[PDB]
Design a binder for these strands. Structure first.
Lengths: 215, 225, 35, 137, 166, 30
RNA sequence: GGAAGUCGGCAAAAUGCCACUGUCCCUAUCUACUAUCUAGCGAAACCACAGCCUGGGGAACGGGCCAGGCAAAAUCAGCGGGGCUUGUGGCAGUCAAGCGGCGACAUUGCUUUCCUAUCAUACCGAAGCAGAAUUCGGUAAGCGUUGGACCCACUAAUAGGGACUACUGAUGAAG
RNA sequence: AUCAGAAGAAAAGGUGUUAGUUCAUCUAGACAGCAGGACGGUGGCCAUGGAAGUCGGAAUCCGCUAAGGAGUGUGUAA
């Protein structure tokens, strides 16, 4: 009766609160601004939830929600914001940044490696030798039992007698090249931890000092 | 031994003839059949791509040995002229104006002894001895007059019906001065002459012949050396 | 049975007409043509 | 079972033995008479009684014979023909009597020695009959 | 070949090269194919698709409805049962058993027809035992001698579907 | 025509269409 | 070849289960006569008027009406022609899209030519479809759908159904 | 409209079109499109050769939350 895109439906029963969720995030941001101390601005990075879970463990609460939504709730103008000189803070307040309560040394030093994300530059020039596939670049003393991965690769790989075989040498990634989605997904099947989680501690919105530096 | 078939027929004794001096195969049909014969005897004996009376059944329509070859009166002058041109000098070729035209079905011969369907005419017996230079015995195999089709015979052995009695096998072998075996071919096909073609050094059998018979022919005809 | 009105019978008929099968008709008329 | 194991292919020739015709038994299997009841490989020709020829296969009943071979309709090969038929060579042939042999559907004949002349056509087609033939012209 | 030989072949040689592309595109275009099928087809095949789409539409409506709930001649021309018998009663029209459904129990019970109580059509039909709509018939209810009313037409349906008078 | 039938309804159909429409209206009235 | 034709030894043939036979497969040839043409003789029945076809005209739709297709003298000989309906039962309860108590599907209880709606041949899609063989479905009526008493074989298959003028040849006046 | 148009099947269906009616989010970035995360107790419990959310029976709970359903499908013997 009308040409329109058919919408897929499922039964998750986990629909987000939408406006209520945004209000809850704003309330949490206000409480985090009302927290005791340590005035951190750092929430997430390219790392998975495991790094976030480990970071949350070493604290007695890192959370940002929708970026620039907490800043909007606080208000860019100093009149709306409860803090001082937040007009310049809001400009710096962007991306995955959130308050915490547990620090500086751990964030500066402890940087665990993790699988790379798209857009970055490869730390090296990974090359996949031809023949049987090597999951960990020939570190197995990486079996050839990857029966379903052969159909799921798409790259120059054919199944020979139940063994995945790359007919031609396929360079997985090269240093200085932007990490494509296909390159990142292909590297996911391998042990390429070409990333390092970082943090941002430029300033601290202390209750008394109110000096959030731009370092 | 070899497993080979003409077209898709196992009876290669009908569609071809083979002796110690030459090989006659059917025409116009499968040249793959000519290739099979040429693959084992091409450089040793001539392989004639011939016909008898405009038919492909030349194997059952002729009888011959290393010395002479016979054809029925039904053969044309053109086909007879063809055979003599292709065949070499030491092999003599003759037209046998004889009672039962199918010479292959009535006469099975080697270089020294021949077995004939008793119902042949005396002049035919005389010329066979004159041409083939063999002794002629007007006997029967398994009680059947068609000696040529039921007794595949060569210089080093012979095969007959499994039905024929042991005393009959001993009589035939002693009168032939050669070892004899009562065997089968082509999974119960009792026409041994029509399924197996034999010379003193090579033998061909139908594709449907099982390994047990092929071992038997190998033993009796001693092709291993 | 494939009928002579079949487009693929007609297609392969064409390719026979483009071998030496038709060459023995091209120069074959040239025989008389030089007489 | 029709046209089965008959080696090559048969040229067209005149039709001699229609349905319900009597032929002599040609082999020494033990039979005397055969009765044609049906002919293999006959199309939808309206009001055409199927007919047989040399080298053809027909369902036959042993009209005169020992009771064991009787009572079982089974195929038979017409080995001879009385109607004049012309070879592709051009010569015209015909025999005294219509004769047929008793054969299993596969192609091996049930006899041991056939009697009298054999049609050169059927000897060409049927190697089994050519294996068990006495004289062919 | 033994057991799951194609599964072994898939395992040891892989499936078709473009198989995922073909099935994904087939999974992509049936929405257009369904509308083309619904608009171009005519006749019985159209009508069957008509009724089966309503089946799936109503079904999908109900399963989704369940979802927020989870989130929240002198002869007898009729059937007969067994001078006075002037007409011919065929053995074909003869009826002996009936499907009597109890009112309170609500179970269709196979009960033999003990007899016909009264035929509302005419006394002659009751005398001849002609089964018709609204005719009272008595049947044995030992396994359940009680009356019942025919809720069907035995002439057309061919089965004596009746409801117990209880 | 171009169709599988004739669009001109024969005068029988022009006759009995209206009366059967009238019987339909009477049925709703009843 | 010798009852396969036909409900069938109807009629001939064989003489004055066997055997014979053109009943048939399948007709062909030959003879006489009618037949046609020529010279002569020469009716009657019948006749409102006439004679191309499709659809429609309340009916009876027709040869006249309407809308079309069309339509070129005179003749000779054969042949007689003249908005239904379908593939899916009946009783009872339960929902319940909803409307105004019903309530839709679902659930539970028991008992010659033409048509395509294609059998075969062509192609096609699906199926644990390995090969072969097969099943179901789609396009498709170009082309076939047999021979003998429900049967018994052949066959690729032996699918289901509707129903004076014209026709066929032969001359022919004329721009 | 691949046979459009100039009360009987009829109720229903159409990724055909055009208007309306009633609800939804939306520069606290709407829909879609993309990159990434889509977790850790835990391979929860009976069930079994092998069942790890996805052969199968009840809950189906929790820490981080901005989110990870004792799991939406494909799939793997697992």
């Amino acid at each position: 009766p009308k040409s329109r895109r058919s919408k897929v439906l499922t039964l998750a029963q986990t629909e987000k609160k939408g406006h209520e969720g945004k209000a809850a995030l704003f309330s949490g941001v206000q409480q985090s601004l009302d927290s005791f101390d340590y005035m951190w601005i750092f929430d997430v990075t390219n790392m998975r939830n495991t790094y976030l879970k480990r970071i949350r463990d070493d604290w007695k609460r890192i959370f940002m929600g929708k970026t620039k939504v907490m800043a909007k709730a606080l208000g860019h103008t100093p009149e709306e914001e409860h803090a001082e000189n937040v007009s310049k803070l809001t400009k710096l307040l962007h991306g995955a940044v959130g308050l915490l309560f547990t620090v500086i040394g751990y964030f500066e030093s402890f940087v665990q490696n993790d699988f790379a994300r798209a857009g970055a530059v490869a730390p090296f020039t990974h090359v996949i030798p031809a023949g049987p596939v090597y999951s960990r670049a020939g570190q197995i003393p990486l079996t050839h039992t990857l029966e379903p991965q052969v159909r799921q690769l798409g790259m120059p790989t054919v199944l020979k007698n139940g063994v995945v075989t790359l007919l031609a040498d396929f360079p997985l990634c090269t240093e200085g090249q932007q990490l494509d989605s296909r390159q990142t997904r292909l590297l996911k099947l391998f042990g390429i931890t070409a990333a390092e989680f970082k943090v941002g501690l430029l300033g601290y919105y202390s209750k008394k000092g109110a000096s959030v530096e731009f370092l | 031994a070899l497993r080979a078939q003409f077209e898709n027929s196992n009876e290669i004794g009908v569609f071809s003839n083979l002796t110690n001096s030459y090989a006659l195969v059917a025409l116009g049909g499968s040249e793959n059949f000519y290739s099979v014969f040429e693959a084992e005897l091409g450089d040793v004996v001539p392989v004639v791509h011939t016909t008898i009376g405009g038919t492909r059944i030349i194997g059952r329509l002729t009888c011959g040995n290393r010395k002479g070859l016979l054809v029925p009166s039904s053969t044309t002058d053109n086909e007879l002229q063809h055979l003599r041109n292709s065949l070499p000098d030491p092999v003599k070729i003759q037209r046998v104006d004889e009672r039962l035209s199918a010479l292959g079905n009535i006469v099975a011969c080697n270089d020294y002894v021949a077995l004939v369907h008793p119902d042949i005419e005396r002049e035919t017996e005389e010329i066979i001895a004159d041409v083939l230079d063999v002794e002629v015995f007007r006997q029967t195999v398994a009680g059947n007059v068609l000696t040529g089709s039921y007794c595949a015979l060569s210089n080093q052995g012979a095969l007959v019906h499994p039905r024929t009695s042991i005393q009959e096998q001993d009589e035939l072998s002693s009168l032939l001065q050669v070892p004899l075996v009562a065997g089968t071919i082509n999974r119960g096909s009792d026409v041994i002459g029509a399924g197996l073609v034999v010379n003193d050094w090579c033998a061909f059998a139908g594709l449907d012949t099982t390994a047990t018979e092929l071992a038997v022919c190998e033993s009796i005809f001693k092709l291993q050396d | 049975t494939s009928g002579p009105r079949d487009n693929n019978r007609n297609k392969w008929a064409k390719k026979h007409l483009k071998k030496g099968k038709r060459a023995k008709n091209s120069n074959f008329s040239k025989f008389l043509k030089k007489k | 079972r029709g046209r089965g194991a008959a080696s090559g292919t048969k040229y067209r020739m005149t039709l001699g033995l229609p349905v319900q015709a009597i032929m002599n038994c040609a082999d020494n299997s033990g039979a005397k008479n055969l009765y044609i009841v049906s002919v293999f490989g006959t199309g939808a020709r309206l009001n055409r009684l199927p007919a047989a020829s040399c080298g053809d296969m027909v369902l036959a009943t042993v009209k005169k014979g020992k009771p064991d071979l009787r009572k079982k309709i089974m195929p038979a090969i017409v080995v001879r023909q009385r109607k004049a038929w012309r070879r592709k060579d051009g010569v015209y042939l015909y025999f005294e009597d219509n004769a047929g042999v008793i054969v299993n559907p596969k192609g091996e004949m049930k006899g041991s020695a056939i009697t009298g002349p054999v049609a050169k056509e059927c000897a060409d087609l049927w190697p089994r009959i050519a294996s068990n033939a006495g004289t062919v012209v | 070949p033994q057991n799951e030989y194609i599964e072994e072949s898939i395992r040891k040689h892989g499936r078709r090269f473009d198989h995922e592309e073909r099935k994904r595109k087939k999974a992509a275009r049936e929405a257009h194919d369904a509308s083309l099928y619904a608009q171009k087809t005519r006749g019985i095949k159209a009508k069957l698709y008509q009724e089966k789409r309503r089946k799936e539409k109503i079904q999908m409506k109900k399963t989704i409805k369940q979802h927020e709930e989870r989130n929240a001649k002198r002869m007898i021309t009729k059937a007969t049962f067994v001078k006075y018998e002037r007409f011919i009663r065929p053995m074909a029209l003869r009826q002996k058993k009936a499907n009597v459904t109890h009112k309170e129990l609500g179970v269709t019970m196979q009960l033999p027809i003990i007899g016909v109580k009264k035929n509302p059509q005419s006394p002659t039909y009751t005398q001849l035992g002609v089964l018709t709509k609204g005719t009272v018939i008595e049947v044995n209810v030992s396994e359940l001698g009680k009356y019942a009313q025919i809720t069907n037409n035995p002439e057309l349906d061919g089965c004596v579907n009746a409801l117990l008078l209880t | 025509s171009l169709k599988k039938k004739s669009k001109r309804r024969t005068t029988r159909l022009r006759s009995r269409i209206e009366k059967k429409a009238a019987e339909s209206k009477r049925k709703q009235k009843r």
